[PDB]
Amino acid sequence: GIPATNLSRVAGLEKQLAIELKVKQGAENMIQTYSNGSTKDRKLLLTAQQMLQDSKTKIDIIRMQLRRALQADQLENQAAP
Protein backbone atom coordinates (compact mmCIF):
# COMPACT_ATOMS: atom_id res chain seq x y z
CA GLY A 1 0.00 0.00 0.00
CA ILE A 2 2.77 2.43 -0.93
CA PRO A 3 1.66 6.10 -1.25
CA ALA A 4 2.11 6.20 -5.03
CA THR A 5 0.72 4.55 -8.18
CA ASN A 6 -0.61 1.63 -6.12
CA LEU A 7 -3.02 3.78 -4.09
CA SER A 8 -4.12 0.56 -2.38
CA ARG A 9 -3.91 1.70 1.25
CA VAL A 10 -4.79 5.29 0.36
CA ALA A 11 -7.94 4.28 -1.52
CA GLY A 12 -9.16 2.06 1.31
CA LEU A 13 -8.75 4.67 4.04
CA GLU A 14 -9.99 7.49 1.81
CA LYS A 15 -13.20 5.68 0.82
CA GLN A 16 -13.99 4.87 4.46
CA LEU A 17 -13.80 8.56 5.38
CA ALA A 18 -16.13 9.43 2.51
CA ILE A 19 -18.76 6.95 3.69
CA GLU A 20 -18.65 8.46 7.17
CA LEU A 21 -19.44 11.91 5.79
CA LYS A 22 -22.46 10.56 3.90
CA VAL A 23 -24.01 8.96 7.00
CA LYS A 24 -22.95 11.63 9.50
CA GLN A 25 -23.97 14.58 7.31
CA GLY A 26 -27.09 12.70 6.26
CA ALA A 27 -28.18 12.26 9.87
CA GLU A 28 -27.49 15.91 10.68
CA ASN A 29 -29.51 17.05 7.66
CA MET A 30 -32.48 14.99 8.83
CA ILE A 31 -32.28 16.25 12.42
CA GLN A 32 -32.29 19.92 11.37
CA THR A 33 -35.07 19.33 8.83
CA TYR A 34 -37.32 17.74 11.46
CA SER A 35 -36.89 20.75 13.73
CA ASN A 36 -38.07 23.01 10.90
CA GLY A 37 -41.65 21.73 10.84
CA SER A 38 -42.16 19.50 7.79
CA THR A 39 -41.34 16.05 9.18
CA LYS A 40 -40.92 16.83 12.88
CA ASP A 41 -41.28 13.08 13.53
CA ARG A 42 -40.39 12.12 17.10
CA LYS A 43 -39.61 8.47 16.35
CA LEU A 44 -37.44 9.47 13.39
CA LEU A 45 -35.85 12.26 15.44
CA LEU A 46 -34.33 9.90 18.01
CA THR A 47 -33.43 7.42 15.28
CA ALA A 48 -31.23 10.00 13.56
CA GLN A 49 -29.62 10.93 16.88
CA GLN A 50 -28.48 7.34 17.38
CA MET A 51 -27.18 7.24 13.81
CA LEU A 52 -24.99 10.30 14.36
CA GLN A 53 -23.55 8.95 17.62
CA ASP A 54 -22.51 5.62 16.12
CA SER A 55 -21.26 7.22 12.90
CA LYS A 56 -19.05 9.83 14.59
CA THR A 57 -17.54 7.20 16.90
CA LYS A 58 -16.42 5.06 13.97
CA ILE A 59 -14.91 8.14 12.31
CA ASP A 60 -12.53 8.89 15.17
CA ILE A 61 -11.51 5.23 15.14
CA ILE A 62 -10.64 5.33 11.44
CA ARG A 63 -8.74 8.59 11.90
CA MET A 64 -6.46 6.87 14.42
CA GLN A 65 -5.84 4.08 11.92
CA LEU A 66 -4.70 6.64 9.34
CA ARG A 67 -2.09 8.17 11.64
CA ARG A 68 -0.91 4.66 12.50
CA ALA A 69 -0.53 3.93 8.78
CA LEU A 70 1.86 6.84 8.26
CA GLN A 71 3.86 5.98 11.39
CA ALA A 72 4.48 2.41 10.23
CA ASP A 73 5.37 3.39 6.66
CA GLN A 74 7.68 6.19 7.80
CA LEU A 75 9.59 4.04 10.31
CA GLU A 76 12.08 6.88 10.88
CA ASN A 77 15.66 5.63 11.25
CA GLN A 78 16.19 2.30 13.00
CA ALA A 79 13.10 0.70 14.55
CA ALA A 80 12.93 1.21 18.32
CA PRO A 81 14.06 -1.90 20.28
Assign residue 22 the CATH number of its domain: 1.10.287.160
Q: What residues make up the domain containing 13? A: 1-81
Q: Total structural domains in the chain?
A: 1
For residues 52 and 7, the answer to whether their CB atoms sit within 8 Å is no
DSSP state string for 31-63: HHHHHHSSS--HHHHHHHHHHHHHHHHHHHHHH
At 12, the amino acid letter reads G
Solving technique: NMR
Alpha carbons 45 and 61: distance in angstroms, whole number: 25
Number of continuous H segments (helices) and E segments (strands) in the chain: 2, 0
